[PDB]
Amino acid sequence: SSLTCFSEGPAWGCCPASWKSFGSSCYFISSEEKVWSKSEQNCVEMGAHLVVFNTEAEQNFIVQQLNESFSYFLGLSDPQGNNNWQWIDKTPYEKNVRFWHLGEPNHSAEQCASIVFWKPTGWGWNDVICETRRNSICEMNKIYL
Amino acid sequence: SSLTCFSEGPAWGCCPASWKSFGSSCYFISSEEKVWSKSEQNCVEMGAHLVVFNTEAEQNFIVQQLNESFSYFLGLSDPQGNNNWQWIDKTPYEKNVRFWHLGEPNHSAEQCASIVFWKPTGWGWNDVICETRRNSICEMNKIYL
Numbered sequence: 556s557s558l559t560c561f562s563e564g565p566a567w568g569c570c571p572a573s574w575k576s577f578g579s580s581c582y583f584i585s586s587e588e589k590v591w592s593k594s595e596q597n598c599v600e601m602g603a604h605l606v607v608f609n610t611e612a613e614q615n616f617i618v619q620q621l622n623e624s625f626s627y628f629l630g631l632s633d634p635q636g637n638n639n640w641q642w643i644d645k646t647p648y649e650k651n652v653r654f655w656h657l658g659e660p661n662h663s664a665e666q667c668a669s670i671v672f673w674k675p676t677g678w679g680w681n682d683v684i685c686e687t688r689r690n691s692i693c694e695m696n697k698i699y700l
Numbered sequence: 701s702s703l704t705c706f707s708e709g710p711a712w713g714c715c716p717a718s719w720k721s722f723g724s725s726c727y728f729i730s731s732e733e734k735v736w737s738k739s740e741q742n743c744v745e746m747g748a749h750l751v752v753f754n755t756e757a758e759q760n761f762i763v764q765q766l767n768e769s770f771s772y773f774l775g776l777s778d779p780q781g782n783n784n785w786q787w788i789d790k791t792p793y794e795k796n797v798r799f800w801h802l803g804e805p806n807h808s809a810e811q812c813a814s815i816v817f818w819k820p821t822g823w824g825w826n827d828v829i830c831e832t833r834r835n836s837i838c839e840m841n842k843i844y845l
């Protein structure tokens with residue numbers, strides 16, 4: 556039963572103490588490995604969703620919290636395998652950022668999006684099979700007090 | 701700048717991140733050495749006063765944050781040297797606890813009070829010269845949000 560709260564120039568914005576804060580959102584990085592649907596379930600049970608990246612500044616902050624030997628499920632999927640990628644919170648895909656790696660996405664049967672570290676580019680999105688187990692990242696709104 | 705907040709079952713009660721929480725107060729243990737007048741001013745510059753002990757449970761909590769080799773100023777003083785001890789917040793001295801060590805207080809000229817660790821009793825209060833330099837303990841109301 557613990558928040559941490561930072562000053563605002565509302566006078567406080569807050570996140571649970573074991574999460575991470577940036578912008579108008581809290582984040583949680585899960586080091587357990589699950590399929591995509593159960594990764595979404597774990598976030599929901601904390602009152603959040605798989606992460607949605609809305610600007611480059613946001614991603615830049617998330618990647619410094621991650622371990623480079625692991626890949627991380629995002630909230631971006633294509634459930635009919637016809638490259639109609641959707642964000643888990645319905646914000647439009649085409650008008651927003653799309654930080655895919657070089658030569659990705661590239662398979663119709665790889666219907667989930669993950670962020671992963673490849674040299675020489677570093678972090679970027681790769682599409683993968685939704686039924687293989689990986690880490691995840693959640694995001695929810697800040698609490699304002 | 702940060703606060704830490706605990707559920708209250710007014711829904712949150714908080715304290716600044718580097719302080720300590722118990723009951724309806726936040727506490728700070730200053731490990732610099734000042735005279736009694738400057739120990740008080742230092743607390744005031746943080747929006748606090750030197751500590752007032754109101755029950756024994758409160759004191760049991762504080763001395764577990766303290767270093768047994770050091771003595772600490774209290775918000776309790778006798779300005780005219782006639783044993784009319786008063787609390788810094790004007791709470792009545794008689795209808796309240798009085799954890800003086802055995803054989804204390806004992807000098808009209810020792811007009812400030814401090815908490816100190818004496819074998820065998822352990823922790824308890826002792827009257828001392830205000831113009832000696834010691835550690836101190838600040839207390840302030842909880843911020844509620």
Ligand SMILES: CO[C@H]1O[C@H](CO)[C@@H](O)[C@H](O)[C@@H]1O
Nearest residue numbers: 659661662665681682683684
């Ligand atoms: C080595 O990486 C390649 O193999 C994985 C299979 O998991 C693909 O998803 C990825 O896009 C690449 O083509």
Ligand SMILES: CO[C@H]1O[C@H](CO)[C@@H](O)[C@H](O)[C@@H]1O
Nearest residue numbers: 804805806810826827828829
């Ligand atoms: C170590 O304690 C003794 O000496 C201090 C002097 O500060 C007195 O206040 C106290 O009563 C004791 O006699």
Ligand SMILES: [Ca+2]
Nearest residue numbers: 607608609694
């Ligand atoms: Ca976002």
Ligand SMILES: [Ca+2]
Nearest residue numbers: 661665682683
């Ligand atoms: Ca792929």
Ligand SMILES: [Ca+2]
Nearest residue numbers: 752753754839
């Ligand atoms: Ca008190």
Ligand SMILES: [Ca+2]
Nearest residue numbers: 806826827828
């Ligand atoms: Ca004394």
Ligand code: NA
Nearest residue numbers: 662663665682
């Ligand atoms: Na795909």
Ligand code: NA
Nearest residue numbers: 807810811827
């Ligand atoms: Na005295």
